[PDB]
């Protein structure tokens, strides 16, 4: 019989109410079986039930009316569906139960119901089984109506050996002994939720717990050897859940919240309702070895996953085209919450960096609107990108500054209350925010890609403003909430620009004007006539006349304008010279973010002399700030992050005072047999210098197997990827790909670091090409992991030959990668790199030879 349904989306006329899932995993044979019972009703007469199933071996399917009838099973593996045919049509509105018996193999990927492993201190391999369903992998563990708008309650039962613990979304009601060495755990019924949020883990994890003031038991789960690193996340999770409950005025509805650190995990974390899961590096904190960056990362990742309990779980997007309703909000709420719960982290100052990263992809033709259509699993996975997360958060921040925090908060509380246990579209959010023209304005920011360039022309008191789509002509127009300050006023002045152009009149003439105050708006600014000269003069003479975020926005925008010929490279580089006086993390890092990519392009070309001169200029520019750093872990989180990055930068570029100190610390660390406690903040620099020799690299690698510290593992991995030894770089690719000595969850990062190694970069792009099929099988087409490997190995090329290697390779893949959005993005980036280098290389050579810092 041919397949009776020819659409990717399921029919809307058969709706589930409740699922009873029985799962029995065998961790010795790596197999599982299940029985899924789903209560359904049909809104129209049908004899066919279409549902999702992927890589499950279905043995039997029956239909119970409320008698039992057998169902004929048909499969459509490409659509990832099964069709269950009943002997007679279902009666409308009457309850039926579909019962499906099946078996599967535990996935060897990081999705579905997959295998995870770890080693004990004695070298014994331990196996656990965990889940990762978002977006479409629930259908790999149980047959279901696997679309987020088909919400249902779930009663989960897990069969296991007595040596294992099982945890799931809800608390454990009871454990029944079925037979010898066979226990069945019954978990309480969940509230109405999407299939992608179902979770279960079978392991020998240990836990620590703490109860919130609202009575919620919060626990952190981890392997026995790492449960002593769970205290920080446990305390942070309790404080953040209490923050969100008080903030939203909507209690967390479940009796418990678990945070599990999984030894193998693809993304950073996942918000499964009641059972949030994390990479061990995103949750576990070692008070002696963890970095300030990693502590910030745990805090923000926990805040993100807990925000999703409201934004994503309680209220879910109707379809993946509106995935930003979940991810943009969760990303933005990390800042809203942590700014209050952990004020010592000063996160609010760092938000804007995400917006500049989103602008890098959003300035290309291959970007997409925040809300855009998706059909198949690879396209849906492509929605987990910088546009949904970072542009999503940045436009919400822009809107909050525009409406005020009070009006914005009222709109989001109304929205969550109105749509609790249901699904929403982009329009529902805008109607909630307008109930406090929001919809017209925010449609310009979510229903078309990109962002505007705002051009300012000052004629005495007359300030002319123009908008145009910034693209590296569509005729796009936005409702832009402009802000500005002047040399006469530091009040934030506002002007809503809804037309191509407008003009305003200043009360008095000014010496300078600066738009996008604190860079809270998702747009860039160009100043005509002497505007850039006036702003450059202000930064050179009195840089604290504007805030550190305003200084960072001027640096970023000046370099973005060079790409479209609005500002010469010489004038942008002249502006950057003020950084010799800068002390603040955001503008110092913004200077690095703009300048470092220039020598990354030179490293992949025969441009050694200008590359070396450019690197010497960068070190000279920040020399006073580098020399002021102590080689300790002293200071605030920003002082520590600034120290670590500056010392690492100085050492990799052979700045002699720092290389000598790093060389001495590494030699002493190796002499001590790795017992010397180095300051965590200098460890990246010390290890990167030490790995340059064969003996140093082998010694660093010998310590890797014993480490229980996520930071130490990450620091060693970074250092090992910096060697000039090509056999060692190849070995890291081969071993992390294999997953024994270095876990495969680190492969995408290792591949990108080697792709950025000045001598070993050809090896990363070659490895990706030669192992494409296995990498796609492990990480999936459309995944953020694949996108980071594609862009990480190719987006710093700047020759027509490299451009054609990329086009030729990906077009030869046909259905296994030729249509990837990351491929078009990297092709467009290489085209821009070719043009930028051709135009600016010798201009930079001449500018460097002028030695303006030495003048
Ligand atoms: O360049 C990189 C990585 N990287 C890029 O590949 C270009 S975008 C970028 C912007 C800011 C910071 C790092 C960036 N890392 C270092 C390098 O020269 O390879 C320099 C910094 C010390 C670590 C090594
Ligand atoms: Br049974
Ligand atoms: Br505003
Ligand atoms: Br005038
Ligand atoms: Br010191
Ligand atoms: Br090849
Ligand atoms: Zn998220």
Author numbering: 45 to 110, 116 to 485, 516 to 551, 558 to 940
Which lines from the publication concern this structure?
Endoplasmic reticulum aminopeptidase 1 (ERAP1) cleaves the N-terminal amino acids of peptides, which can then bind onto major histocompatibility class I (MHC-I) molecules for presentation onto the cell surface, driving the activation of adaptive immune responses. Given that ERAP1-trimmed peptides modulate the adaptive immune response, controlling ERAP1 activity is an attractive strategy for cancer immunotherapy, autoimmune diseases and increasing immune responses against pathogens. Herein we describe the hit-to-lead optimization of a series of cyclohexyl acid ERAP1 inhibitors, found by X-ray crystallography to bind at an allosteric regulatory site. Binding of peptides to the regulatory site plays a critical role in determining ERAP1 substrate length requirements and the extent to which peptide trimming occurs through a “molecular ruler” mechanism.
Also discovered in the same high-throughput screen as the clerodane acid derivative was the hit cyclohexyl acid compound 1, which had ERAP1 inhibitory potency and a selectivity profile similar to those of the clerodane acid derivative. Hit compound 1 was found by X-ray crystallography to bind at the same regulatory site as the clerodane acid derivative. In this assay, compound 1 had an ERAP1 pIC50 value of 5.5. Three major binding interactions were observed from the carboxylic acid of compound 1 to Arg807, Lys685 and Tyr684. These key interactions are thought to be where the C-termini of endogenous peptides bind. The cyclohexane ring occupied a lipophilic pocket, and the attached amide did not clearly show any specific polar interactions with the protein. An additional hydrogen bond interaction was observed from the carbonyl of the thiomorpholinone motif with Gln881. Adjacent to the aromatic ring of the benzothiomorpholinone was a pocket containing lipophilic residues Phe674 and Leu677, shown to be occupied by a water molecule. The first area investigated was the substitution of the bicyclic motif, as the X-ray cocrystal structure indicated potential space for growth into the lipophilic pocket containing Phe674 and Leu677. Compound 1 had reduced structural complexity compared to the clerodane acid derivative and was therefore considered a more synthetically tractable molecule for hit-to-lead optimization.
